[PDB]
Swiss-Prot record, chains A, B, C, D, E, F, G, H, I, J:
Keywords on record: Capsid protein, Virion
Localization per Swiss-Prot or TrEMBL: Virion
Source organism (scientific name): Sulfolobus polyhedral virus 1 (SPV1)
Protein function: VP4 self-assembles to form, together with capsid protein VP10, an icosahedral caspid of 87 nm in diameter, with a T=43 symmetry and composed of 420 hexamers and 12 pentamers. VP4 proteins arrange into hexons, while VP10 proteins form the pentameric densities located at the 5-fold axes in the virion. The stoichiometry of VP4:VP10 is 42:1.
Protein name: Capsid protein VP4
GO CC list: icosahedral viral capsid
């Protein structure tokens, strides 16, 4: 229960400034059968409104604070990994292009069917506007024919301040406190 | 796992005002084999009245307070997902047609056959009349021929107030305290 | 003189607050030759501006109070019941789906061709918006070929607060006085 | 004709203790073509949730107070009484197996096609658990060949107490005043 | 400059209580080639969440105040009305299913292809929960073969309150002063 | 661990008045291959003295307090649902024939051969003498030849009071103090 | 953790009088392919000093206190039940041959591999000298050829006073408090 | 003259701090013949020093304040829409990529030749540095061969503070006032 | 799962006396395919300097305090149990050859492929020199031809005191407080 | 949730001194087909700026504090261990070339394909420069032809002090607080 402490913290702290906390899914898709070297995953986040913030390098909006909490891999993707239908490796998580903060431990290991699934080391906080980007470093790449792209799901805790009041003073006071 | 706590919370709070607490079954089902993009699941709720509330966008009746707690996916759906007979993805939960408050974590991973079947994080409140509506965001959609529609069953805790002295004044006094 | 007593009671109580009191013929028709089990009549009320509120489980408009007072059965229905061209049985009357208030005593004996037609037990009031569903539990069903659906006419005293100077909370404020 | 006075006597007296008043249908039927002497009618009451109490000597459940108010005989019995296809006579109504409380006035004269349809004198109150049994004492028995059994329908006012704060001390305090 | 006045009137009153004023587009479509009598169009608003709130008789949720302010008909519709490919007529705009509020002047004449098209008479507000429903009363129906359904677009100013600090009585406090 | 909390709660309250708390097993059997509509399962409990309280509409004895706590389905029943040898559906639980208590979520999904089966929502109490009745509302019914009746096992915590110093009213005072 | 709450309770109370607390495994094995009616399983406990208390109806020695805490079925025994190679059923647990205290919920359900496995209802204290005996009431008996016996394991927390200073007044002083 | 109320508002408030106010024309051009679903147009502003801020997602510099005042469609584009040579639809206007503020009413309607052209709903203030993006959700897409891309013109009032003494302290004192 | 709680208990308490805490692996293996009765496993521990204490009934060195925490069974052993190639049963743990201190819960249920893998209850503290012997009590022994010996691995925490200022007087004061 | 315990300890203890905490995947691989005796796996850690500390017996750089936390084995290794393509065994973990602090429990049981993977005993911290060496002590070595090297992945938390205003003596000053 590492997401739930973040959720209770975002509910408790962002309430007096006026703050709308919810949780969503982010999909990292490394397309087109990675087999040789380090590639770049297509990020795709779904916030309120069906905006579908897609493509590489999702800039956080100037009124929100994001919290990347956990990540996992779906069970047919794990079946494709262990049979050599798609590549295994790690995912490096960057902030503002320079700051490496996490390396996901070997995405074959974080299958959701295992109760002994290894998690991320920490829930990474993204401030107002900053460049979230990820990279896929493959070890033991895809070998068999008819290969499939890689997909890794993340869980984001979005704390919104845009609909509250003048959102600038609220978001800077909240990012100072929490 | 939260469905036993919000039931026990609903019983001990509505008793100063008088009220049913009971649980029903909600079925959300997208029509006809989602393969491309975001579709709409058809909600179908049954209540004590032997009355179906079909179609999209169910309206909560004027004296009830619902609670959306958990969800699960049966085994004949989960064998269709891994064989590519139907689409994976998440399900978005809207209130009043504007607000987004949850995203169900990857309907393959809340299947009844996964030993780590995941639950929903927190229960969704619904006051007197408001518009519950849902949307299905497909990631890795259906590819195989002779595909099948999705079906994801939910669990709603219903707090009826029809047996009080006046059901209209009682339900607007308990909606503030619960 | 049971319709005229609650009509006179409504027009003396809803009159200081503004009340458009009138009567309406309601129709409930269980469709297509009921022969085995518990069926469902399709409700129909013909309200003031010729709007035909149809379908099962009529939802009461937000500014109205209804009063189900009488029930009868036409002569071409009753001459078909005794010949086995349609089914007998009772009719259950619900409120919010959960509260049973009446059971109509044997719609063949509520016919109008008999000079001592039996009446209902009580006039059941009906608040602002609240569901009204009816259920048909047939005993001695239809036997002969070329059968016909049932038709049971009711008679409802409608109170209406739409054209007064106050919203849908003054309707409830004048409902608890009654 | 007495059903409307005792129903308003129930919804007013059983209201400060919490009381859910509604009406049902009871069917008494002597089996197998009464032609000589004292017969026994087979009672059949139908409470809400398809609770079919059957057989002779029904017992009132420990949360309800019954009232037996009126009776009627349908027309194809009354056209069989006058032709000697079934027996005439009265019906004796017992309580606790000891007291004789009423005698229904000549079941041929309570037919639904009599312009002077005779009703019952006063409604007989039934407390929690108490045996309601009936008896049929035929005068002018059945004489024609191919006879038919008798059927006399009743109408019961049921005062349920399942929704009070204390369903046991509410009944034994409301039985004293009603 | 009629919708720009009620949009400015909303943002001067939704400011002290919180509130999210935004403009939408409502699409009423009488399906499948009306040729004889009065039909019912399928109302379909598109809110912030790309919510296809479909079906007849939309319900305004408990935290929103709508304003129906405009109507127009596109050019490919208007070339079909004059050609006899779909029906002409007016559209009745009902509140709660009871009140008639307005009547549109002859939907072929509020086309957008003409430089001085007709307008509505007043901007109809809608309070918290009320049933917005419409009806299409055809005059000069479709005559030739391969006919088309009607479609008439509207323009709604929606005053939302779901993101306020307590969206339960802020919407009933601002409904008074507006 | 759901029965083990309501068991320890029962032995904590019923001990200073005397009380024989123990656990039984109840078997509900929808007879002979349901394929169309709502049917009636045969309740069959086994109390201490090999007394088989059978038949529909069980009456709880006057000296016992039952607790319905758990439900599950054996493996050769669950392999009959998936092959179409018996019907799926839900189970409605009515207390006193009026009050609905719960609705079991889809008896194929509380099978015991799955590692993550679903649970009930709350432990239902049943007072001194009361009528427990159940109904099986089938969805996706049986289709194959040589079909079988349904069977769903429960688990009852029974608080017997027959061996106290005076077992007449102590069973209801200890019912109310819980 | 029901066994751990008794183990931490036994070492707290039996410590000042001096008392050896440890856990063991009691094996009730119904002999040779139960197929028709009620059987009697051979209990077999393994205490400390190389001794094996076998046979039915184990007499507890006068210096020990036993606590029957949990019950489970091994995985190769669960495979034999679901294939019909051995019988299913429940287990009756008696004290002094007479008092029925528990009934195990359907031993096919309590397979140790499933994490959602229903346990015993409560940890049963067995006093100094007092007979422990069990019975196996089968339902769905063994059908297949080459059938097998039944085996259900148990976990007993055993408190011992035989090495104390005065084994008479240590037991009767610790049986009261503990 | 909604721009002239804004242009005379900008030259009055930004004058004590020193600030350049002028108007320009922003071009939203969906590329290459939208025919199926939602696309994204390329914003293209023309600032002072001969630059063309092309590409999606215009970033406001840290010294400027923008105002989106009206919208229209050129007459050769309105000829191409009504003849089916390019697509019709609405346009969504976002602030910070998330907050929807307007939905332009059906861009075929706002042709500059009609005097009865529906304008933009409101003049949107775009704060300092903050993403501006637009989307085009088509209805009745382009059908005819040799189709053309879309173009929708906008009028932007640019308030500029880059020539003050301190361009940091000038904006943050005038963004609060204006 | 108890390994991490006893490890920090050692490195906190044995640290003021001078203490060197680490972990190792113990291998217990009964030879030659147990099929009849109680067997003896060959203990084999590996301390740091390849100190291979082997054979039955190991002796603890005079400056260490051991801790036996968990145990596990690998999958090529678990597929031999369910195929009948090696025996099931529990393992009894003695200290000084006299006291029985623990019983490992059914080594087929301690396997590494059980999603509910059972651990040991409490770690058994082993002082300086104290004969650690184990025994295997087989229930349902091996039946198939070509059977295999058992192998059950353990986990030992060793608290060494070889580096204190007086290694003999340090243990006898640290064993007294740990 | 053992990696996140020392990661949260690192980010709150190295924060007043200035410290950039992140995670890193480590690799240890015994080269070229271990078959008889004790071998040596080649360590390989990739710190963020693509400098690859390789070879046996890594030296920690002067401004970093490491924490060796997790270990696992990928699935193409675990299919090779059980099939005799590479060796089983344990791994010993040293520090400063003198201290043994861990032993991994039989790396084939530390595989990731099993739902009950066993973990390490404790998170081993690592000071500024101190040699980190590992040794492979195999049991049951490689048997089959075409054998493979071993690979065991780790997970290390790296604390980095490169951005402070103090040289490498603040690092050991923050090693004195941790």
């Amino acid at each position: 229960s590492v997401t739930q402490q973040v959720f209770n913290f975002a509910v408790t702290k962002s309430q007096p400034f006026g703050g709308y906390v919810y949780s969503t899914n982010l999909t990292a898709s490394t397309s087109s059968a990675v087999t040789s070297t380090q590639l770049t995953p297509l990020n795709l986040s779904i916030t309120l409104g069906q905006i579908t913030l897609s493509g590489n390098s999702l800039v956080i909006p100037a009124t929100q604070i994001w919290y990347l909490t956990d990540a996992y891999v779906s069970v047919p993707d794990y079946t494709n990994i262990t049979n050599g239908a798609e590549a295994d490796g790690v995912i490096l998580i960057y902030k503002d292009g320079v700051k490496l903060m996490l390396t996901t431990p070997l995405i074959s290991s974080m299958s959701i069917s295992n109760p002994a699934r290894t998690h991320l080391a920490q829930a990474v906080k993204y401030s107002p506007q900053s460049i979230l980007t990820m990279y896929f470093n493959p070890t033991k790449p895809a070998t068999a024919s008819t290969s499939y792209p890689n997909t890794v799901y993340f869980t984001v805790v979005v704390v919104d301040f845009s609909y509250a009041q003048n959102p600038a003073r609220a978001v800077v006071s909240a990012n100072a406190v929490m």
